[PDB]
């Protein structure tokens, strides 16, 4: 029932994601010199360094907000991919599966702690 525990749990999950080779295309903002039309397709860029910095700045109130930004990294990859078989998009799918598998208990524990707090 610790309402604050999600933050360190998210820091540790971000550390695992940064060690994962599949996260390399998503660690920093997409380079517009490499992908000149990126902002014509993607309205809201997102990357894991921005998520980590937002968390460390104390600018997430809950793990649901962090989860919405991580999911935006994956939906941006899906929206920008020219093919469902592209290398970078395939890396995003594996990374998304790993993220979803690990964030599920973080979200459940937070929501349970908050319900206990408001009982
Ligand atoms: C295949 C889809 O492409 C992406 O997801 N990108 C990762 C971020 O930088 C641009 C390329």
The kinds of small molecule bound in this structure are: ethyl morpholine-4-carboxylate
CATH architecture grouping? Up-down Bundle
Question: What sort of overall outline do the alpha carbons produce when their principal axes are compared?
Answer: elongated
Distance between the termini: 12 Å
Instruction: Tell me how many strands there are.
Output: 0
Biggest beta sheet summary: none
Number of helices: 5
CATH topology: Histone Acetyltransferase, Chain A
- Summarize the amount of helix as a percent range: 55-70%
Order of helices and strands: HHHHH
User: Rg, please?
Assistant: 15 Å
Q: How many domains comprise the coordinates?
A: 1
Structural class: mainly alpha
Oligomeric status of the shown chains?
monomer
CATH superfamily heading: Bromodomain-like
PDB class: protein binding
Keywords: PanDDA, Fragment-based drug design
Assembly: monomeric
Entry title: PanDDA analysis group deposition -- Crystal Structure of PHIP in complex with Z31721097
Q: What report would you give on this structure?
A:
- It comes from Homo sapiens.
- It is found in: Nucleus.
- The modification Phosphothreonine is found at residue 44.
- The protein has five helices and no strands.
- Helix 1 packs antiparallel against helix 3 (48-56) and helix 1 packs antiparallel against helix 5.
- The chain is elongated and about 50 Å long.
- The chain is mainly α and 119 residues long.
- 64% of the residues lie in helices and 0% in strands.
- The termini are close together.
- It has a single domain (1-119), classed as Bromodomain-like (Histone Acetyltransferase, Chain A, Up-down Bundle).
- The structure holds ethyl morpholine-4-carboxylate (UVM).
- The site of ethyl morpholine-4-carboxylate (UVM) has 10 residues, from helix 4 and helix 5.
